[PDB]
Amino acid sequence: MDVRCINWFESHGENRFLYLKSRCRNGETVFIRFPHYFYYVVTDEIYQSLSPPPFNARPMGKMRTIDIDETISYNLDIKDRKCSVADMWLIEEPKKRSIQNATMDEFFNISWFYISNGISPDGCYSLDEQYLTKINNGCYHCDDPRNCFAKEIPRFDIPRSYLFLAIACHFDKKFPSVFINPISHTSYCYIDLSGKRLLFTLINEEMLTEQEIQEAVDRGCLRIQSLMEMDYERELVLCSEIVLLRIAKQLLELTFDYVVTFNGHNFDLRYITNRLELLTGEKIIFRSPDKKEAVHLCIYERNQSSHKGVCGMANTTFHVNNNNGTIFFDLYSFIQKSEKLDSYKLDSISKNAFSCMGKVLNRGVREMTFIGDDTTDAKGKADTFAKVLTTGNYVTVDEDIICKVIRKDILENGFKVVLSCPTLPNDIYKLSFGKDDIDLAQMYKDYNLNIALDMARYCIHDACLCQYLWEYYGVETKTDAGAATYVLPQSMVFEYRASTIIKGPLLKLLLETKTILVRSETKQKFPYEGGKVFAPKQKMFSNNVLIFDYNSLYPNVCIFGNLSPETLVGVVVSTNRLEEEINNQLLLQKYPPPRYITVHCEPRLPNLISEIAIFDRSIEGTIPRLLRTFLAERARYKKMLKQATSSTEKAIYDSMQYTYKIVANSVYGLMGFRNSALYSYASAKSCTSIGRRMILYLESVLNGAELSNGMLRFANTLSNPFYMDDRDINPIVKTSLPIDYRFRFRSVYGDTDSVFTEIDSQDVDKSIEIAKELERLINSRVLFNNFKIEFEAVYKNLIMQSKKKYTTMKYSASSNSKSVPERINKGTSETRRDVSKFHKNMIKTYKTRLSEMLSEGRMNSNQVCIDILRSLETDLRSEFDSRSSPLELFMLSRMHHSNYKSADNPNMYLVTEYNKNNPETIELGERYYFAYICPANVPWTKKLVNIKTYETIIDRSFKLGSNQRIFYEVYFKRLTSEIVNLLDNKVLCISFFQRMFGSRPTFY
């Protein structure tokens, strides 16, 4: 009677049904089957004139339909927008019907289900039993969801079951191939509803000698020949391949809540199912709760195209076709969409996710002892590391040395781990769980019992990493939060982008406000100008910079201007100044500012000189309410973030509020998207015009402000640049700072919605006090209505390179001068994914040295330029001849896709040839590594004719041949330009290139 919703899913048979999976307070699972309908919205005069009677129909109220097409006029004789009001019906029909005058046909049928019956996807309910008919054991049918789910109750917690799985396949030299290679190991982590956790690995005994198999049993292993004698509480079981696959079948056919794998939808499950089919007559069969459909396990590929002029394909995913309510969840696709890495391999993700700072507790001849706790790092990192340590095998030190774990002791709060490593003369090191140094190919060549047991240990770890990442990213929390806000089923939360996920709240708003938006014309795309970006005034500041940033500027612009397709009064254009002045003289009288806002936009057509968009702010439209909805959610998750304690809690809540940031901004993108239902050229262009004025207003009043004895003087009169108001616009305002303070403010940079204001100070504690008081005066006297800013941070030793490139040491707005700053980089080569690690290491060294000696200042002759260049040339020449650096430092990352024009693009060719000549296939959404490799006999040259001909795609098994070398000419040139671009000299810098590379640089 009391259930919590877990999932929704549909059948694929002739009769489509919608199923709910939910669990009761006591742990029992119940399914409810709902009839599926197609929903159509028609007007009264259409409803009464439908020749084929509808299956069912109910009135949905009296609604207003607004035609939201946009036309330009050359005068002020603007007519009222076409609007009609009529009683309308919502009709449901089991089969598709063609209705000549149906509207609101851009919403999903599942969305109509949820909204019409007032059902939230993840709600907790107390159901009225008289509407439920028992059809099977644990399955009911519900004909009246409107009254069955009327009662909602507070949320309660339920148990859930998990299956985490991984396999290891045999190979001799290359990627495994299903037609030859047997399965070696299978590992599971089995978690029941009781919470009992079982860990076990199965070993393929067919690759061991009979004497070795008996030795395994003597050591404590179990040997089984059939399935009826299997026991899941034993850590190691030896059996033949037939048993291995039948066990995999038995487990996968169970009604788990989640079955979680990492890239198992293309490899793990595919291998298991394909090999089972040949060896025996069994197949993996999924069945619906009511046993009216049964399907064999099949993997389907979903191709995602782009929306450019040559769209092509940009991503691909694989899905399991189960119909039993289980969610098959793949970490690979989830993480690839969420995070940014050089690569998304399991070792790379773990290396970054599971790490901490550990202290050296003891030292030895070949062993070091590392101790970690909350006293040496951020709270919770030592505990997360300790948790993973339970099953881990190797620990990486300072992201470079792979060390074997010899001893592990898990402490009440931290850990003590003993690693086999050379003595490292320091006290603090970074520990993480990353790459292993094992060689599987050699381990198969010499495969024996001792290897089989070590591989079983590795395999269960890989299966456990899926659980550790599951919790680390808070996947369970994100799933339910998404389903509730987007009105989507829990199974579909992470598959759709903005165009679809916003349909849930959008339908609610349209039905609540009694509005339908329709079009009668053809859309045409026109360009428009974006936000303002300032040019940096100085390269090096050597001063503290106060950064002030508008809080979600876009949503406030639409609310301020009431910008939406249905609120536009009109667009008035002129071709000549005489008409422009006449239209302005009438405009200021026809549409008084107290009710209307006028936005002066750039020309739309090349034969126009002026365009004004007129918006009516007296009635709030639909987009402002959609934006308010997302603002409310983001604020709620930001508030919870402020209350988080552990590093895990903070990461999860920070990620969710970021997600709401993006969807709120994408509402604009949909308004500017030529194929959107919300497309509005006038509104999108007007939004950015208001934004540009808003940034210039704040920048102008701060540039030249001065802090005096007890009063702040703003540079310019604080006059609202949109309309006249009753605010006191006097630029002299009272502050609460001490008389000791005397400072001048200058604007040195600015980007999209933030202003970089330099203060003539070296201290941070004074900078924080002034910045906080300065924000108070700005929000209370300078800005108006809902426009507010926050003080972000103090940037110390800020250096500017371009309009999108800078580096600084960040002091947070809540951190005093005694704190440790964070070193942050925007747009620099130290953050890019397409350069190298060789470049990054050197540019950091030289840029730091340049800043330190230039900030101090000597300049006896040409010290700064010559000192950097001389050291650079020495290191570049030394590396070329030494050739000792690992290839891993010269690897670039690139994405593969088909989004191209002409078909002869070298990028598609390079990958296509790789795929043809290798068992490894690069798919259209994957990232791969490549390098510039040339024959070892090629000397250092100066004249570079071809670059792309040196690109090769490298797999994990790639080894640089004795007849090859790294094409240093391209790696060194790129680094040299980045360093030289930081120098103020020309004569010596040009000479550097002429002797080293044989070229002349460009000095920007």
Binding site: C311, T575, L578, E581, I582, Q585, L586
Partner: protein, 418 residues
């Protein structure tokens, strides 16, 4: 299904003939191309973003040397002095040799469609523009003949040449003597450049022109009146012979100057200049010679008169008077003139009345400030004087006070006319 076969068959149909496609047919073609490519991953044909209308396939180099004619039946039509235009069915008219926007009346567009509705075998209609008079010259068709098309054109208000039909029964050596005989046999009163003849069975037109190359001395340049403030230039030689000029651009591109020798083709009836080989010098010399009070408006010259109410009534097709009130009394009575006043803005109505060219007049307006009271102009001044370097812009400004007088008057007519 049939839906896919329709898309594929329509794509093949348009592909075979993309040279008779307008913007809508081209968009349909390119949409079907994108549909095919995305549906099947490979398509035989690609999108088209070129192919302009051309009639060059039907003509050849003009023959100016004697030649033999063996075939019998020919039809001969004249080619008149003047600019050549081509008209397409259901479309506007385009000036041959350069794609532009030229002022075309409604009477000719209607008459063109009326004859082109007779049959679907006509590719285009050829027209010649002579002193703001339109004559139809040709209408190439795969099914019709150049006889009934012209007869219908005449009934619809268009001018047509004198149809001649000639059959050759011998081996004739075509020379200037026969050219003169057959040219005068048309009994036409308009200057002609050449004669175009066609053979029954072919669409190709062949053109003959017998002329002599010479030099002549220009004594003066003058403009003749052909309409209401519309003047056309001509070139007068020392002997008094009038050399025909196509338009204002003709003299500028031919680099014609006064009191010098220019290249000219001499014909048996008149002399003609040709365009085959600075602009600031030549246009200034022409203006100074014909008169300081003339300026260029498109292809012709106009004067800078002090036109007032008497000329406003002529443009509005109402009674000629000097009373402002009558500018609303009659308008409310005649529905054929009220439409013009209410449909167009005051800016264009007063711009037309003084014969100002659109492009240069707007350029002046956008470099000068206005002060308006109750949407009526009370003052103005120039803020950017660089626009005055073009002689047309300075001349237009010199008489801008007349524009303001009419502009303000029409503004009050609109306020009371509604």
């Amino acid at each position: 299904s049939s839906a896919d076969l329709t898309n594929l068959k329509e794509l093949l149909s348009l592909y075979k003939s993309l040279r008779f496609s307008d913007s809508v047919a081209i968009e349909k073609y390119n949409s079907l191309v994108e549909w095919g490519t995305s549906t099947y991953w490979k398509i035989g044909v690609q999108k088209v973003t070129n192919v302009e209308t051309s009639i060059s396939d039907y003509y050849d180099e003009v023959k100016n040397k004697p030649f033999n004619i063996d075939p019998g039946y020919y039809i001969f039509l004249p080619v008149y002095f003047g600019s050549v235009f081509i008209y397409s069915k259901g479309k506007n008219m385009v000036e041959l040799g350069s794609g532009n926007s030229f002022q075309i009346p409604d009477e000719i567009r209607s008459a063109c469609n009326k004859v082109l509705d007779s049959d679907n075998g006509i590719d285009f209609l050829r027209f010649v523009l002579l002193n703001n008079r339109w004559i139809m010259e040709d209408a190439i068709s795969k099914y019709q003949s150049p006889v009934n098309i012209f007869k219908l054109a005449s009934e619809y208000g268009l001018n047509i040449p004198n149809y001649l039909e000639i059959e050759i029964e011998e081996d004739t050596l075509f020379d200037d003597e026969l050219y003169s005989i057959m040219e005068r046999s048309f009994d036409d009163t308009f200057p002609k450049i050449s004669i175009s003849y066609i053979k029954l069975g072919e669409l190709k037109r062949q053109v003959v022109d017998f002329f002599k190359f010479s030099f002549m001395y220009i004594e003066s340049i003058k403009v003749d009146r052909i309409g209401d403030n519309i003047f056309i230039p001509s070139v007068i030689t020392k002997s008094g012979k009038k050399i025909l000029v196509k338009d204002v651009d003709h003299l500028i591109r031919s680099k014609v100057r006064e009191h010098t020798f220019v290249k000219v083709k001499k014909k048996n009836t008149f002399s003609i200049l040709y365009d085959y080989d600075t602009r600031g010098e030549v246009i200034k010399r022409i203006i100074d010679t014909i008169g300081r009070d003339y300026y260029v408006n498109g292809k012709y010259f106009s004067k800078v008169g002090i036109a007032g109410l008497k000329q406003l009534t002529n443009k509005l097709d109402i009674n000629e008077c000097a009373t402002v009130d009558e500018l609303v009394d009659e308008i409310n009575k005649s529905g054929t003139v009220k439409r013009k006043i209410k449909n167009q803005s005051v800016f264009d109505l007063s711009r037309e009345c003084l014969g100002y060219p659109e492009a240069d007049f707007i350029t002046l307006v956008n470099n000068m400030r206005f002060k308006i009271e109750n949407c009526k102009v009370v003052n103005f001044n120039i803020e950017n004087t660089n626009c005055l370097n073009n002689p047309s812009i300075e001349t237009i400004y010199g008489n801008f006070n007349q524009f303001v007088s009419i502009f303000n008057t029409v503004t009050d007519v609109k306020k009371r006319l509604f």
